[PDB]
Amino acid sequence: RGIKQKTLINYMSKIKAIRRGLPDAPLEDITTKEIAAMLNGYIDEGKAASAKLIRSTLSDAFREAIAEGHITTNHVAATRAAKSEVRRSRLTADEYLKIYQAAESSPCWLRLAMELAVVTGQRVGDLCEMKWSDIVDGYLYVEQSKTGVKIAIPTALHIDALGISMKETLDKCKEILGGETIIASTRREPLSSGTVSRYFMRARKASGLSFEGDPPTFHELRSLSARLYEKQISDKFAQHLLGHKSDTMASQYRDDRGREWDKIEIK
Amino acid sequence: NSVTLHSWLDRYEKILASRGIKQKTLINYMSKIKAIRRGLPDAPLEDITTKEIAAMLNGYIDEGKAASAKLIRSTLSDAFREAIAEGHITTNHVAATRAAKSEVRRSRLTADEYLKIYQAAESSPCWLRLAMELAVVTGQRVGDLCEMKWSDIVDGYLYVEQSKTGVKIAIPTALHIDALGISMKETLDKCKEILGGETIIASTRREPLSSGTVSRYFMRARKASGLSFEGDPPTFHELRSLSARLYEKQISDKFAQHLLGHKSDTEWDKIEIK
DNA sequence: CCGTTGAAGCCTGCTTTTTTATACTAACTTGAGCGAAACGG
Structure with missing residues (x-):
């Protein structure tokens, strides 16, 4: 897919965690439940950002599977993505x-x-x-x-x-x-x-x-x-x-996040 | 009955002949159809699986011709979309695949x-x-x-x-x-x-x-x-x-x-003072 | 200098007003195991 080196490593780091948290059973046999059981297992440990990347990478893995005649539907696009504030x-x-x-x-x-x-x-x-x-x-x-x-x-x-x-x-x-x-x-x-x-x-x-x-x-x-x-x-x-x-991050990279009050002058 | 893939591709070419396009353009699509002929067996459309479609597609992507795969995938998809219009099948098993991004x-x-x-x-x-x-x-x-x-x-x-x-x-x-x-x-x-x-x-x-x-x-x-x-x-x-x-x-x-x-409208910009 | 009357207060069902979307793409950041350089005997 033509990646920029480092980015490829990131994916492998998310894939190595799935094979260790989910059985090597048939894809069609993989219910949506066993996918949320592992996902939520990393949400309680504070790793909210991790659960978002793992589900996004795992979900895309099935889209390619469906394209090559393996499964009919993606049981990963049914689960929710854990939001994480900076x-x-x-x-x-x-x-x-x-x-x-x-x-x-x-x-x-x-x-x-x-x-x-x-x-x-x-x-x-x-x-x-x-x-x-x-x-x-x-x-x-x-x-x-x-x-x-x-x-x-x-x-x-x-x-x-x-x-x-x-x-x-x-x-x-x-x-x-x-x-x-x-x-x-x-x-x-x-x-x-x-x-x-x-x-x-x-x-x-x-x-x-x-x-x-x-x-x-x-x-x-x-x-x-x-x-x-x-x-x-x-x-x-x-x-x-x-x-x-x-012009979307020009206002987000301007935030304070709750450090110093945005002093409003006469202007 | 009257089904099969090839039989449709023959009634499909005539359809594009009435679309009213450039000469060279019509030829480009024909060359893509012929590739599909020797790329997929002769059987009913409802029998063709998404796997076989991606098996042929990726085959042209590995050979180095990623650009060709895009057109062949975009053309084969149009054939099925026009096939459903006639009432031949019910779904387009080509819309499930993904075109390979090619860089010039x-x-x-x-x-x-x-x-x-x-x-x-x-x-x-x-x-x-x-x-x-x-x-x-x-x-x-x-x-x-x-x-x-x-x-x-x-x-x-x-x-x-x-x-x-x-x-x-x-x-x-x-x-x-x-x-x-x-x-x-x-x-x-x-x-x-x-x-x-x-x-x-x-x-x-x-x-x-x-x-x-x-x-x-x-x-x-x-x-x-x-x-x-x-x-x-x-x-x-x-x-x-x-x-x-x-x-x-x-x-x-x-x-x-x-x-x-x-x-x-549709490299090294300069950062002005103002 | 006790007893009645009225500005408030919560419960429910609405009725609006500000924020954040979906997804690959490309990095950044704190461990910990590891090999070579540089100073102490």
């Missing part, structure tokens, strides 16, 4: 500096990757894949991997809510870090995306904070960046920099 | 590549070079480029009647590509001196040429140049795609759309 909190500006000072004990690239992920508002994965050759005439050509949307971030961008410049942070990664990638390690070599966030969680718990539910993360730097880019300049600006095009 | 793998053409092909077209006759520059200066399709007569040119214009869509436009004899070094006027007059016939693009015998030979000989100069690509080597039709790509950065985007013959 428990991940949002990051604030006053919380950003706190983690900034708690990253002192941490390597140097962590204090630069955090400032570069809030000034450009780029994805973590596409943040560790940007070479110094992707910067021409003061423009940072970034090609996302998720959606695959290309953009150009001008070096003339700075946040007055944190006191950081993109031209000052960029050059601060050429001397301290030094490498083929804007964000390298202590060995002048690239760094995985599943490690840049790891070192960020350490300073989080060490900074001694306190949130409601699931604590923020490195990915939250993209949310805080857009939240500031919406009041600093405009809304049409923090909609293209993130690589977004639709 | 025909590489595009650049400016450097075109220059390498035009020069390699030396061994080729004296009408190919003219057909190349013309197909890029007009950005028209190979089908109409062969049906262009010198009578179409009226007071500095170029009346072109697209056969595919049917759009009617007039390309002025003042255009000029500023990237390859070609001029509409200088190109047309070059065809009146060298060629010399009733049609803008003729043969060495002063006679019109088919649209299947214009792109055929173009292929020879493609593999003779010695250029490597990624996927399937571009074709003569790509000159139309290269034409627009150039005019969009030479004049305007609204100009390329009007030149190609489009009406409605």
Whole structure:
């Protein structure tokens, strides 16, 4: 079906759980009951999001089965899908500096990757894949991997809510870090995306904070960046920099989720 | 009684013959029907299962021809839908399957590549070079480029009647590509001196040429140049795609759309300050 | 300075007003087992 590598692994992770939670008996013999018995078994453990992906992947498995002469109906399209609200909190500006000072004990690239992920508002994965050759005439050509949307971030961008410049942070990664990638390690070599966030969680718990539910993360730097880019300049600006095009998430990525009250001014 | 699959496919072809469509179009469907003949046994429609339909479909998907599977699946489905209308069966066992999503793998053409092909077209006759520059200066399709007569040119214009869509436009004899070094006027007059016939693009015998030979000989100069690509080597039709790509950065985007013959709208965007 | 009268209060059946849809697609994030680099004897 032409997949993007990683996505394929996700499916296999959901299929390996079905064969372990459901007998290897005939498909036509598989009633709707035995499908909800296993499904609900993962809903009580708090894994509500898991039950949604398992039922969606298992349901599609039967649609293909019906197409190849195996079964007549899908007994998975009869069960309900478990809704799951986001428990991940949002990051604030006053919380950003706190983690900034708690990253002192941490390597140097962590204090630069955090400032570069809030000034450009780029994805973590596409943040560790940007070479110094992707910067021409003061423009940072970034090609996302998720959606695959290309953009150009001008070096003339700075946040007055944190006191950081993109031209000052960029050059601060050429001397301290030094490498083929804007964000390298202590060995002048690239760094995985599943490690840049790891070192960020350490300073989080060490900074001694306190949130409601699931604590923020490195990915939250993209949310805080857009939240500031919406009041600093405009809304049409923090909609293209993130690589977004639709007009449905421009209001969802603006929410607060119950962190800080939406202060309504005279305007 | 009178059932069976094949018996229906014979009474189905006549139905499409009265639909009132293009000639070449009707032929495309026929080639799909013949494939179904040697792809499925001769038995009543109510006996054909969804399994056998997907067994033949996927067989063409694995061979590499995923695109063909889509049309054959979309055509075979129409036959049954018209079969139910007559009262033959009750259900369409083809609407249960799923068409295989195919991605276009025909590489595009650049400016450097075109220059390498035009020069390699030396061994080729004296009408190919003219057909190349013309197909890029007009950005028209190979089908109409062969049906262009010198009578179409009226007071500095170029009346072109697209056969595919049917759009009617007039390309002025003042255009000029500023990237390859070609001029509409200088190109047309070059065809009146060298060629010399009733049609803008003729043969060495002063006679019109088919649209299947214009792109055929173009292929020879493609593999003779010695250029490597990624996927399937571009074709003569790509000159139309290269034409627009150039005019969009030479004049305007609204100009390329009007030149190609489009009406409605349907890479590295810039993030402005405001 | 005890006894009657009226602004409220819940039970039921309506009568509206704000949110979220369905689904592949593509990631992100905290374990834990594992191999190589770098410092202590």
